[PDB]
A and B are shown apart, each in its own frame.
Chain A
Amino acid sequence: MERIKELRDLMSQSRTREILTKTTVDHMAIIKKYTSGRQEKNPALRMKWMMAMKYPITADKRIMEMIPERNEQGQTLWSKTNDAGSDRVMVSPLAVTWWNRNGPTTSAVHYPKIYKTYFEKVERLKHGTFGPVHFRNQVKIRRRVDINPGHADLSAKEAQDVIMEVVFPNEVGARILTSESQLTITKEKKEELQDCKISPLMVAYMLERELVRKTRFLPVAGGTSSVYIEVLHLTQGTCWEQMYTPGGEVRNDDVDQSLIIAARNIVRRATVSADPLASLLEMCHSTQIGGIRMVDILRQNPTEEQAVDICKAAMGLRISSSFSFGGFTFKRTSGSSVKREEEVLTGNLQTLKIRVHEGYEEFTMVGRRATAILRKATRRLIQLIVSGRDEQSIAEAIIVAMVFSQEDCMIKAVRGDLNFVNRANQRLNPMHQLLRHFQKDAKVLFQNWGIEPIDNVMGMIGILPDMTPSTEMSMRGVRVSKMGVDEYSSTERVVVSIDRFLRVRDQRGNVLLSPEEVSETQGTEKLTITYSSSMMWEVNGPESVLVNTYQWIIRNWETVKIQWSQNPTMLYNKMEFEPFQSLVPKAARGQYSGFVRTLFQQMRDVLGTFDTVQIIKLLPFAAAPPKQSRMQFSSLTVNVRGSGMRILVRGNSPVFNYNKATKRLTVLGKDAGALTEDPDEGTAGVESAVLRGFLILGKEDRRYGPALSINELSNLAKGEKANVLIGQGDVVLVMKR
């Protein structure tokens, strides 16, 4: 209502009426930006020179009544002098800090919602886990990536339209949404903003920031997933590198993409390996992705891919079927077949023996960027339909089908040097060699296949040798189509054998996989590939001495757990913890020892407190002769590369982390044994083996005052509860004994 009253008052005057009437809606932008003050050419100089003056800030007129003229001392906070070309009055930064320390309060509970992207970023960073740092050359290739972690797959204009419809329903204009996905996201947003008190402009800006997708050109090497590119400055260097696992939406898509690329790489490397089976097994057991081990995902996620299936079978777990050909996945759906072990000649007159199959049979081709369905007979193709995306995809599918047909029209087309021996001097599969030869270009296979008539049924399009559709005469048996997906996703995982050279086979005797099918494409992982291999323990690295020590105490846990309780002095003075002690610095051995022994002793004293991780962690430090002391520690240093790696008493670390899900212990990126569940594990929230003379009753409470620190706790006395901030910025309650 007051809008029209203000409009009337404004138009009452002459100049205001003239500007109101003459100017049209289009000129509003020009009138808004109409200003005499030009932009700063050197903002830094002006800012440095302006803060020296009094009143270098401009604030709305409301300051006049919201903030006093002067603070307690008498320093002016605002001046009635007006700005150059506005009603804003001039104030000094004293005004800003006065507002911050005395200004009206408010409930900011909705602030995390409005800026949800930044708080989600902090959430990811807080829950992220680090690993060892590797010094090694980085091939910093430059490519385009996505910088928005949660882009909603919308163009800038489409995103603007969605924002305007969500926040400004009436101003949407002529635009009407079309895609059902847009409508779904619009409804999702509208439901959650049915009542929001913040200004519409802020909501619109937030939706624009968290919907529009952003792309920038960066020198990335490893990653490219929007979550990884966010922290690119922390996991990528000129010579150094680090493994980082963002603590966020471990989306199945990203995990499976990383798994697929890792499978491709491992298979490619195993192909050249002297003993591919053993090397593949050890490397699969000696690598992880995104902080999760390869075996866990492999046994968990079912994902169809030649390399992925190869890894699945290698472990001996349940293995898939539906044989593949030329990188495509074939599923028979009709008929029997028998090989014949026959002999023939080529067009280049080279003689060769092959195995041709019997019977009429239909097949369901599948692939990465194509799809097809085939019907054939003994040595003879019957029909072929294809569903590729691009024209070269259909060409690939067609040449693969022609090779699969084993027709003499293909045999009498082979021309040139096609030697069936590998780099390793291993005779190569004939089929893959033909299929690789016909992938440069299959011109001769096209002019030598044949021609037939067609009924012109369904209005189907004709075939193309070199992009020439022929709607009345065409290749024999071959058809043109474009389906959306193959017949159906197969339903059976089979058993198999493997030769030394990784030639997978089935129960009957047919061939199922081989190192020639591994597509070949060199993709980019989404999650960091923790390809632990050279990354090692030399002949005896910490991954050896240290990592191994923890492994020994894991394996002998059954008698250490009971020797730890009775006669423990004969466990500390043990011949297995001596290589470890050589790494602890000679000055802080006995201090650590007294600390840890007092920990374990008062952990034995009070009942209901037992954590196997603490005992497995702190024993190599109690080996040394005990020197007494009065202080306390948040970590324990061990010298690994003239560098002090700190092992945290309370909680996990990049050097020592026990996963609570898969129960594996992990030292330095190397597995060190599965850890077992003692039934006497006190699940009471109490931790008696973190502080020297103090327990940990639980989480913080605001009654006992602010958070004291580790090095200021001797002030307390008997029975004096208190709060302490320890660990990775975590406050807890403690109690003296």
Chain B
Amino acid sequence: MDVNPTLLFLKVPAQNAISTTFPYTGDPPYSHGTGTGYTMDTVNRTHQYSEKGRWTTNTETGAPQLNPIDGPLPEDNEPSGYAQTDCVLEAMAFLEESHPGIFENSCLETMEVVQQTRVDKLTQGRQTYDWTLNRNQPAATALANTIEVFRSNGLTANESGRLIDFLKDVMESMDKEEMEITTHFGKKKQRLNKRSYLIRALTLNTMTKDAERGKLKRRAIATPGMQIRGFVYFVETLARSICEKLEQSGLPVGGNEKKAKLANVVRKMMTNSQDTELSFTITGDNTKWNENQNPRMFLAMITYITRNQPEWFRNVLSIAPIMFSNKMARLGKGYMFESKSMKLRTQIPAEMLASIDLKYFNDSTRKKIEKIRPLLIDGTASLSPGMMMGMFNMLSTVLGVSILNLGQKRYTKTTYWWDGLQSSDDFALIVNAPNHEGIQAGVDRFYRTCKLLGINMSKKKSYINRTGTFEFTSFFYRYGFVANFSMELPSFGVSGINESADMSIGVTVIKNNMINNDLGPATAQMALQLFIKDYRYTYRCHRGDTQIQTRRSFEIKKLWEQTRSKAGLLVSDGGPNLYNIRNLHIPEVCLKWELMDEDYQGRLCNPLNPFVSHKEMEYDAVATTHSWIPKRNRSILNTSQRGILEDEQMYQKCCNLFEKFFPSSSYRRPVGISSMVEAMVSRARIDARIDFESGRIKKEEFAEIMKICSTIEELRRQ
């Protein structure tokens, strides 16, 4: 017998045993080098789905740009980026008519948000490209550098603390005659003329995407600069506000709410239909979603949403698509060469691709360079006619929801009609009709309308079958959603934060999978045992009874011997495991409280210990000595950016002192626009005053503190 797992589907319906076909147990494919081979391909393809568009030449950045909007209607099924503005506005207007007052309320909420938001919100972000070093720096570091340069160069309106003030600074910067920065290499002053700074503000940094499941070919993902971050934030806020009010938009909610919405839609469509009507669920998928959402359509949507709103709000919302329409996509790391005969290798920056000869490359990269060269300007390529990756998923989902709404049988004016649920890049459409040709006509109408709006259905990944069985972004549905457990498999291992955090996170993951993904009792117990085994093997915290020999075993054994109630030690200190199917919701240290020795209990959770980091998926945690934090890579030391570490040290010292002065700074972010020294001195003076008025402080101490504050103020004023 030749065992054949796939033959199991002759009996088990595919949906039920669908977890078998998810190879999520092996290392995901990882990009092994430079993302400059995929970025050029993305640029070329984006310019190839819109070549019939209207070329032009931007008069500020001085780079060619493509304008496909209102282009010739597509004549073949191939992807087309020729969105029609009239059709987009019709979709939006019908969406507003079907949902009266959606845009007005969304604009009100966003006006409140934009008037209220602070500059600190830009720190809560992932890697961003900071335009002052031409590298990728964390969000906070990039924001700090940008604010430093703005203050140095005369822009200071962001000191008010509101985000919109920083945006005003950003806009006023682009008009500055010549910016200058003081980057190190002892430091030099590099001056950027108007055009250079403008091109650097609009530039996008592109890096290859890593750890992608379900694709054979690597993609490219881009991260926006720091000037475009705030406008994108406001636009995303508006789009989320709009989507939260749409029953057919699944993007702004979690998995379970997606399940609820999709089940509701299926029940509404299939059940309400009479016996004679047919039904058909299209589990489709859009192809080249990003390479066709032209930002000018986003500007049209933003202008139609913000009708009858204050001009300032309209402008601050519209600035984002205006900046994205002129974006330049920084190529990337640049290719690398080798010499088999001479036995050496060289690295060429991506900047010199415009000037380097084509005698080095392959037969494909040579064509890619030959085709991308016209668009290059100062080491970056114009990428006007498309997006790079998301950054507007909410608004794109709004567009998808509008096109889904456009077939409510009030706009179809025909027997057939459709609806469904839209999540950016993924849709499920449910057609109805009185005969099969009706379904055919409905599908054709939907496809053509989507093509007009500039979004293409993928015909090689979509099938239409009688309602019931269907799929949606990996939530398979067979007369009721079936839980596939292979998607959440990667979460079971030790997360890797620290000991207590790892224990809490693992037990919480097991509990959640028992709740949602229908993990059985016995399987939950085996997952618990395997997690404990992995956790012990990773943290060297074996049970103590064992004769394991490791770098940490000696004093784990010593502590085990010392203790009296050995059944109370934390699993991190070699204690027994006491979890089961009924204790998964109780944090470990709270679980063994009754069984703990007084001495060990006191030593364990001692605030004086130097390991707790004063805190930092929602995993229920308890402060304990096992909450230490891991080190950092320390790889900067070799580079020329050694001085940044001194900046970090000084900033931490100052912020710790401020924390000392203002107790609430740690809990709630400190607001205000008074310099730090002035705030500290004022607080000290008022504290001394109130203490002397009624308290411990006496006249001598009051005089000493007041004179110290006076000399501090004198030192400040110098």
A contacts, CB < 8 Å to B? 1, 3-8, 10-12, 15-17, 19-48, 50-51, 54-63, 66, 71, 73, 75, 83-87, 90, 92-108, 111-112, 115, 118-119, 121-122, 125, 142-143, 160, 163-164, 167-168, 171, 198-202, 204-205, 217-219, 230-234, 236-238, 240, 706
Find the B residue at minimum CB distance from A144: B257
Which chain A positions have C-beta within 8 A of B349?
none
Contact, CB under 8 Å: B555 / A4: no
Contact, CB under 8 Å: B610 / A60: yes
Contact, CB under 8 Å: B606 / A104: yes
Given the contacts A47-B630, A231-B585, A15 and B712 also touching, CB distance less than 8 Å:
no
In the bound complex, how far is the Cα of B159 from the Cα of A479, in angstroms?
A: 60
In the bound complex, how far is the Cα of B677 from the Cα of A92, in angstroms?
A: 38
Which chain B positions have C-beta within 8 A of A27?
119, 144, 147
Contact, CB under 8 Å: B651 / A31: yes
Asked if B559 lies at the interface with its beta carbon under 8 angstroms from chain A, I say yes
Within the complex, the shortest CB–CB distance from B685 to chain A, in Å, comes to 10
Within the complex, the shortest CB–CB distance from B323 to chain A, in Å, comes to 22
In the bound complex, how far is the Cα of B263 from the Cα of A143, in angstroms?
A: 12
Given the contacts A4-B684, A96-B626, A118-B622, A201 and B674 also touching, CB distance less than 8 Å:
no
In the bound complex, how far is the Cα of B663 from the Cα of A168, in angstroms?
A: 7
Which chain A positions have C-beta within 8 A of B669?
28-29
Within the complex, the shortest CB–CB distance from B379 to chain A, in Å, comes to 24
Contact, CB under 8 Å: B628 / A4: no
Within the complex, the shortest CB–CB distance from A221 to chain B, in Å, comes to 12
Contact, CB under 8 Å: B651 / A42: no
Checking A23, A43, A238 against B518 with a beta-carbon cut-off of 8 angstroms, the contacting residue is A238
Given the contacts A44-B494, A57-B628, A84-B632, A35 and B608 also touching, CB distance less than 8 Å:
no
In the bound complex, how far is the Cα of B670 from the Cα of A32, in angstroms?
A: 11
Which chain B positions have C-beta within 8 A of A85?
632, 644-645, 648-649, 652
Q: 28 A-B Cβ contacts within 8 A?
A: A16-B650, A20-B654, A25-B676, A26-B160, A28-B676, A29-B669, A30-B120, A30-B140, A31-B144, A32-B651, A36-B137, A38-B127, A41-B211, A42-B211, A50-B630, A50-B631, A56-B630, A57-B611, A58-B631, A61-B610, A84-B637, A86-B652, A97-B556, A104-B603, A105-B599, A105-B603, A121-B586, A198-B607
In the bound complex, how far is the Cα of B321 from the Cα of A397, in angstroms?
A: 54
- B381-421 near A? 1/0 per residue, CB < 8 Å: 00000000000000000000000000000000000000000
Given the contacts A35-B141, A219-B256, A24 and B674 also touching, CB distance less than 8 Å:
yes
Asked if B579 lies at the interface with its beta carbon under 8 angstroms from chain A, I say no
In the bound complex, how far is the Cα of B127 from the Cα of A57, in angstroms?
A: 25
Contact, CB under 8 Å: B610 / A63: yes
Contact, CB under 8 Å: B663 / A171: yes
Given the contacts A122-B586, A164-B667, A19 and B654 also touching, CB distance less than 8 Å:
yes
Which chain A positions have C-beta within 8 A of B263?
142
What 10 A-B pairs come out closest when comparing CB atoms? A47-B496, A26-B161, A85-B648, A25-B672, A33-B140, A217-B256, A60-B610, A171-B664, A101-B559, A43-B496
Find the B residue at minimum CB distance from A200: B663
Asked if B465 lies at the interface with its beta carbon under 8 angstroms from chain A, I say no
Contact, CB under 8 Å: A36 / B496: no
- B678-718 near A? 1/0 per residue, CB < 8 Å: 01100010000000000000000100010011011001100
Which chain B positions have C-beta within 8 A of A50?
630-631
Asked if B584 lies at the interface with its beta carbon under 8 angstroms from chain A, I say yes
Contact, CB under 8 Å: B590 / A30: no
Within the complex, the shortest CB–CB distance from B370 to chain A, in Å, comes to 35
Which chain A positions have C-beta within 8 A of B646?
15
- B659-677 near A? 1/0 per residue, CB < 8 Å: 0111111111111111111
Find the B residue at minimum CB distance from A38: B138
Within the complex, the shortest CB–CB distance from A484 to chain B, in Å, comes to 31
In the bound complex, how far is the Cα of B656 from the Cα of A19, in angstroms?
A: 13
| One of B198-206, B308-316, B508-516 contacting the partner | B508-516
Asked if B602 lies at the interface with its beta carbon under 8 angstroms from chain A, I say yes
Which chain A positions have C-beta within 8 A of B141?
34-36
Contact, CB under 8 Å: B140 / A35: yes
Checking B144, B582, B600, B609 against A231 with a beta-carbon cut-off of 8 angstroms, the contacting residue is B582
Contact, CB under 8 Å: B586 / A164: no
B contacts, CB < 8 Å to A? 118-120, 123, 126-127, 137-138, 140-141, 143-144, 147, 151, 159-161, 210-211, 254, 256-257, 259-260, 263, 493-497, 502, 511, 514-516, 518, 520-521, 538-540, 551-552, 554-556, 558-559, 562, 564-565, 573, 581-587, 590-591, 593, 599-611, 614-615, 620, 622-623, 625-626, 628-634, 636-637, 641, 644-655, 657-658, 660-677, 679-680, 684, 701, 705, 708-709, 711-712, 715-716
Contact, CB under 8 Å: B603 / A204: no
Contact, CB under 8 Å: B593 / A112: yes
Within the complex, the shortest CB–CB distance from A41 to chain B, in Å, comes to 7
Which chain B positions have C-beta within 8 A of A217?
254, 256-257, 260
In the bound complex, how far is the Cα of B176 from the Cα of A42, in angstroms?
A: 41
Contact, CB under 8 Å: B610 / A94: no
Given the contacts A7-B657, A105-B602, A30 and B144 also touching, CB distance less than 8 Å:
yes
Which chain B positions have C-beta within 8 A of A5?
708
Given the contacts A43-B496, A217-B260, A168 and B672 also touching, CB distance less than 8 Å:
no
Within the complex, the shortest CB–CB distance from A71 to chain B, in Å, comes to 6
Contact, CB under 8 Å: A25 / B630: no
Contact, CB under 8 Å: A23 / B657: no
Checking A12, A60, A111, A236 against B605 with a beta-carbon cut-off of 8 angstroms, the contacting residue is A111
* 16 new A-B contacts at CB < 8 Å, known A58-B631, A234-B582: A7-B684, A8-B708, A11-B712, A17-B715, A25-B672, A25-B675, A26-B671, A37-B633, A39-B138, A47-B494, A59-B628, A83-B632, A85-B648, A103-B609, A108-B604, A108-B606
In the bound complex, how far is the Cα of B496 from the Cα of A6, in angstroms?
A: 37
In the bound complex, how far is the Cα of B511 from the Cα of A430, in angstroms?
A: 53
In the bound complex, how far is the Cα of B143 from the Cα of A34, in angstroms?
A: 9
Which chain B positions have C-beta within 8 A of A232?
515
Given the contacts A30-B119, A87-B649, A62 and B610 also touching, CB distance less than 8 Å:
yes
In the bound complex, how far is the Cα of B613 from the Cα of A201, in angstroms?
A: 13
Which chain A positions have C-beta within 8 A of B587?
118
In the bound complex, how far is the Cα of B43 from the Cα of A629, in angstroms?
A: 85
Within the complex, the shortest CB–CB distance from A138 to chain B, in Å, comes to 10
Which chain B positions have C-beta within 8 A of A93?
539-540, 552
Contact, CB under 8 Å: A202 / B623: yes
Contact, CB under 8 Å: A34 / B562: no
In the bound complex, how far is the Cα of B630 from the Cα of A83, in angstroms?
A: 10
In the bound complex, how far is the Cα of B147 from the Cα of A200, in angstroms?
A: 33
Given the contacts A16-B653, A22-B151, A26-B120, A90 and B645 also touching, CB distance less than 8 Å:
no
In the bound complex, how far is the Cα of B495 from the Cα of A40, in angstroms?
A: 11
Given the contacts A28-B676, A56-B630, A108-B605, A100 and B623 also touching, CB distance less than 8 Å:
no
Contact, CB under 8 Å: A43 / B591: no
Given the contacts A17-B715, A94-B555, A43 and B495 also touching, CB distance less than 8 Å:
yes
Given the contacts A7-B680, A75-B551, A101-B555, A201 and B666 also touching, CB distance less than 8 Å:
yes
Contact, CB under 8 Å: B667 / A204: yes
In the bound complex, how far is the Cα of B624 from the Cα of A202, in angstroms?
A: 13
In the bound complex, how far is the Cα of B514 from the Cα of A231, in angstroms?
A: 11
In the bound complex, how far is the Cα of B611 from the Cα of A5, in angstroms?
A: 27
Contact, CB under 8 Å: A83 / B559: no
Contact, CB under 8 Å: A101 / B123: no
Checking A44, A95, A240 against B495 with a beta-carbon cut-off of 8 angstroms, the contacting residue is A44
In the bound complex, how far is the Cα of B189 from the Cα of A238, in angstroms?
A: 67
In the bound complex, how far is the Cα of B627 from the Cα of A202, in angstroms?
A: 15
Contact, CB under 8 Å: B606 / A106: yes
Which chain A positions have C-beta within 8 A of B701?
1
Contact, CB under 8 Å: B614 / A26: no
Checking B591, B649, B660 against A86 with a beta-carbon cut-off of 8 angstroms, the contacting residue is B649
Which chain A positions have C-beta within 8 A of B494?
44, 47-48
Contact, CB under 8 Å: B675 / A23: yes
Find the B residue at minimum CB distance from A163: B667
Which chain B positions have C-beta within 8 A of A45?
496
Given the contacts A1-B701, A3-B660, A34-B140, A51 and B667 also touching, CB distance less than 8 Å:
no
